[PDB]
Write a protein that binds this ligand. Structure first.
Ligand SMILES: Nc1ncnc2c1ncn2[C@@H]1O[C@H](COP(=O)(O)OP(=O)(O)OP(=O)(O)O)[C@@H](O)[C@H]1O
Ligand SMILES: Nc1ncnc2c1ncn2[C@@H]1O[C@H](COP(=O)(O)OP(=O)(O)OP(=O)(O)O)[C@@H](O)[C@H]1O
Ligand SMILES: [Mg+2]
Lengths: 71, 385, 71, 94, 101
């Protein structure tokens, strides 16, 4: 039962994501720290479009910048 | 023509007359239908009314009572009333319930499933025996096991010997393991269930045996039946890695197939055809002679046999008079019958790119050369000599 | 279950617009580096609201939904 | 791959310098231009390897149009775009 | 006059027996239809005498009047499964001119 109830929530989100078009509204902005488990039905075009990257690697310049503000 | 219409004309107005006589003189007599008949149909309908709630008979108690489960949650200790066969109600069956006070008023339900339709082929292949060019000897080991005991069950019963059960069609690729299955499935006109061996690996755990128990149950119900298992090699060799039960899972499913094939059940008439290309991989318990009786084997068509194969594919085709069939056979030296079919299909395609109906001699020579390069020799018998 | 009248569109919302005073205290100043990311998301979320016209004129499709992955 | 199993095998090479120009134009028809831009010279300069990449030069040019609040996709925007797209592709692909 | 005859008699129409929405699973030749109200189970129930069972066919969303759940009318909208899988994948239409290259 648990799964069959999540499928409904996930269908609705996809349906109304295309309805959002031609409004002043900017679509849902959402975060996940996992990328392998995502449903690729969200990342098709016309729904979620832009993918932001956040690196783990820090070069020497970008590291000093973070130390600067906390300190 | 004359006599078939003439006898039908007499039978179909004599049928008319007898049905009128039975209808008039069973309505004026109240002991047969008449008075009971016009009140039971109207009452039965009216009393229970609607909605009729479908449920599932969870189990039946021998005393004309049952425990049925509504999808709406409440269970009920019901009674089993008028107009139901009480032997037909068994666990799993779907029943129609009288909504005012829950009693089984009957089952009217076919209960057609996509589980029976997926196994079933509505086959009408244009192939009949003698679309197999030569290899005539092999055809007449397969027909003696599968087809013949349906035509003449007299011979095996006179002799006193139990019919042979099961076959395995194995050999080199391209010798028509699938093409023979199609010839023998067309003639018998028995229920032909088809199931490819790859399907028996699926992702969930323990589903393999549930799927394997289901196939043979449809077949035993539909006797006489054939169950063709195409490339049962596939489960041993491959490792799709979708099934997270790993290799342990594949072994437990295999053991289920072994029990359904003979085991304890004592099933009805079920012949089995098992096609494979590599009999080595197959578990030795499956091949064991007792579940299968005859192991047919094929080999690569000969130079005399390849003339027969070519004659079948070149007959349908339109040709010019410039073609010479004999120069296309000799160049290839030991090439299967699958390649001969592609060589004809490739030539007709070159002529259709040039857009002329005739397939001339040049379209054949360009096609034959291209097909020898696509192949890949055989470094098994190259090792040898 | 007759439909005897209507309610407002803003009402009967389980989760309502925060910001009255629950709006968090962090700002672009406390944030440090990740200058590439700041620019992307400002272009993804902020510029469409203030100026819808720019995107239509130039003839680019506006970035709609935004996704954030990272470790 | 056995004979008679399929019937046709299509191969797609990575686009040549000639092909890139055509493909870059189909994506440019959707958005503004400016007189005098040679869509051919930007395809050559872009080494590239995909038509996916090529489409990203157009979208990235539109990003450089927003920051300066241009009124038209100009010749400077493509030169900046080519770089951003090529540098991002080479850091992940090597 | 159409207005005022309607307003006064409207109060007696609004004490409705309600209605339900099912969907035609399959018919049978007793003039009865198997329809599923979605939260609950399925029901076999007959059509009103006036509409036919010929009108009804594969997966038409149907009206019901809650009392005996009598089928009343086919609804404008159909639900069909094969269109919905090609819609969620989302592939936009193309042409030979777009491919060129
Ligand atoms: N002995 C034969 N006589 C005539 N035609 C043949 C023969 N063998 C193969 N063919 C032609 O080749 C086609 C493909 O053959 P088929 O599918 O039976 O090969 P196969 O040996 O079963 O391959 P696999 O190893 O994949 O099972 C057939 O449809 C048929 O037209
Ligand atoms: N660029 C930065 N400048 C200043 N502080 C930072 C920066 N990046 C991270 N931090 C500090 O690290 C903390 C952790 O950040 P945050 O909780 O937003 O990570 P997250 O990406 O949401 O992780 P999760 O995967 O748990 O959601 C912040 O609250 C902040 O104090
Ligand atoms: Mg085969």
């Amino acid at each position: 039962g648990s799964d069959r109830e999540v499928q409904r929530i996930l269908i609705e989100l996809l349906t109304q994501m295309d309805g959002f078009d031609q409004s002043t509204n900017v679509k849902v902005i959402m975060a996940t720290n996992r990328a392998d488990t995502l449903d690729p039905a969200l990342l098709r075009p016309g729904r979620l479009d832009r993918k932001i990257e956040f690196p783990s690697l820090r070069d020497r310049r970008e590291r000093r910048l973070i130390f600067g503000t906390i300190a | 023509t004359r006599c078939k219409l003439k006898l039908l004309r007499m039978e179909r107005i004599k049928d008319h007359l007898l049905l009128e006589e039975e209808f008039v003189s069973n309505s004026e007599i109240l002991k047969p239908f008449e008075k009971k008949q016009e009140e039971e149909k109207k009452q039965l309908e009216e009393i229970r009314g609607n909605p009729l709630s479908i449920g599932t008979l969870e189990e039946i108690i021998d005393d004309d009572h049952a425990i049925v489960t509504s999808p709406t949650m409440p269970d009920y200790y019901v009674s089993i009333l008028s107009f139901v066969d009480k032997e037909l109600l068994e666990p799993g069956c779907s029943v129609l319930l009288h909504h005012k006070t829950m009693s089984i008023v009957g089952v009217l339900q076919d209960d057609a499933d996509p589980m029976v339709s997926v196994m079933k082929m509505d086959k009408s292949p244009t192939e009949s025996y003698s679309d197999i060019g030569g290899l005539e000897s092999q055809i007449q080991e397969i027909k003696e096991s599968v087809e013949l005991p349906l035509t003449h069950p007299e011979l095996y019963e006179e002799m006193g010997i139990k019919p042979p059960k099961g076959v395995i069609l194995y050999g080199a690729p391209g010798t028509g393991k699938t093409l023979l299955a199609k010839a023998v499935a067309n003639q018998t006109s028995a229920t032909f269930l088809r199931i490819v061996g790859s399907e028996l690996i699926q992702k969930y755990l323990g589903d393999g045996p549930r799927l394997c128990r289901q196939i043979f149950k449809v077949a035993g119900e539909n006797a006489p039946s054939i169950v063709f298992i195409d490339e049962i090699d596939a489960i041993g060799t491959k490792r799709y890695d979708s099934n997270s039960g790993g290799e342990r899972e594949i072994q437990r499913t295999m053991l289920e197939l072994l029990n359904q094939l003979d085991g304890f059940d004592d099933r009805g008439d079920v012949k089995v055809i098992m096609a494979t290309n590599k009999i080595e991989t197959l578990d030795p318990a499956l091949i064991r002679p007792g579940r299968i009786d005859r192991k047919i084997l094929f080999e690569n068509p000969d130079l005399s046999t390849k003339k027969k194969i070519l004659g079948i594919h070149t007959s349908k085709m339109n040709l010019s008079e410039d073609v010479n069939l004999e120069t296309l056979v000799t160049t290839k030296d030991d090439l299967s019958g699958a390649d001969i079919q592609a060589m004809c299909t490739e030539a007709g395609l070159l002529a259709l790119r040039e857009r002329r109906m005739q397939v001339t001699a040049e379209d054949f020579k360009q096609a034959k050369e291209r097909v020898m390069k696509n192949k890949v020799e055989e470094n098994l018998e190259g090792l040898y000599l | 279950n007759a439909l005897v009248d209507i309610l407002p569109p803003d009402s009967d919302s389980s989760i309502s617009v925060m910001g009255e005073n629950e709006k968090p205290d962090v700002t672009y100043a406390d944030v440090g580096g990740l200058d590439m990311q700041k620019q992307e998301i400002r272009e993804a979320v902020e510029l469409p609201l203030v100026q819808a016209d720019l995107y239509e004129q130039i003839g680019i499709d506006p970035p709609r939904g935004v996704l954030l992955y990272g470790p | 791959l056995r004979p008679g199993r399929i019937d046709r095998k299509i191969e797609f090479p990575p686009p040549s310098v000639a092909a890139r120009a055509e493909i870059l134009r189909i994506h440019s028809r959707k958005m503004n231009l400016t007189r005098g831009i040679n869509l051919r010279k930007v395809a050559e300069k872009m080494n590239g390897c995909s038509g996916a990449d090529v489409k990203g030069v157009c979208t990235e040019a539109g990003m450089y149009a927003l920051r300066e609040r241009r009124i038209h996709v100009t010749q400077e925007d493509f030169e900046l775009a080519v770089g951003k797209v090529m540098n991002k592709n080479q850091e992940t692909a090597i | 006059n159409d207005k005022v005859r309607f307003i006064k008699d409207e109060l007696r129409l609004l004490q409705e027996p309600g209605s339900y929405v099912g969907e035609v699973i399959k018919i049978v030749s007793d003039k009865k239809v198997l329809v599923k109200v979605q939260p609950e189970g399925k029901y076999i129930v007959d059509v009103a005498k006036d509409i036919n069972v010929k009108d009804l066919k594969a997966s038409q969303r149907v009206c019901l009047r809650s009392d005996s759940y009598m089928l009343h009318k086919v609804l404008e909208n159909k639900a069909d499964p094969l269109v919905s899988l090609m819609m969620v994948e989302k592939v936009p239409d193309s042409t030979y001119d777009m491919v060129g290259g």
